[PDB]
Amino acid sequence: ESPPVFIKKPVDQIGVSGGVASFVCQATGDPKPRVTWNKKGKKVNSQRFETIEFDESAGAVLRIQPLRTPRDENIYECVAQNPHGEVTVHAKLTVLREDQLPPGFPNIDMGPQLKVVERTRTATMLCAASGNPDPEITWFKDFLPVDPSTSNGRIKQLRSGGLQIESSEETDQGKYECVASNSAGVRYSSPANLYVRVGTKHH
Ligand SMILES: [Cl-]
Secondary structure, three states: OEEEEEEEOOOOEEEEOOOOEEEEEEEEEEOOOEEEEEEOOEEOOOOOEEEEEEHHHOEEEEEEOOOOOOOOOEEEEEEEEEOOEEEEEEEEEEEEOHHHOOOOOOEEEEOOOOEEEEOOOOEEEOOEEEOOOOOEEEEEEOOEEOOHHHOOOOEEEOOOOOEEEOOOOHHHOEEEEEEEEEOOEEEEOOOEEEEEEOOOOOO
């Protein structure tokens, strides 16, 4: 037996009004725990605040969209629970107006566009971002973080930020977002849908 332990602790976010922020939380334990997002002890669930569970509910993403300031500025609680305990980690959300952004705040100079790719072919979605410090690029698909390093080589992130799917299958279809992050804050690209098609034929 063992009580819950967090294996992914959520990180603070400084986002931009009208944009998106996501927090990711995951725990382990024996029995395997659940995790649940709350605000001041109350379940988080509303039109703009959505939880997306993963890992048999031992994981949860808290997504806020579109961000509103000042109302969304708060501390949020991820609670992990199993029969042997209940434990909490916190993450802070700050939301800046577009006219209050510091100089180096991340910018999506060119985000990804609608992608159409024939099955089995390579698809590359670009994301060109800038900031000071130079922002780290990550990707989300259907509101969940993409981890290319655990994709068994199916997916990779290019050095210049693009997300590349080596051999496209129907399962790669979905809604992709690029995220640029640095010490100043976080900025999401507009989303881009990816569609897989069949080839042309004579008849
Ligand atoms: Cl439950």
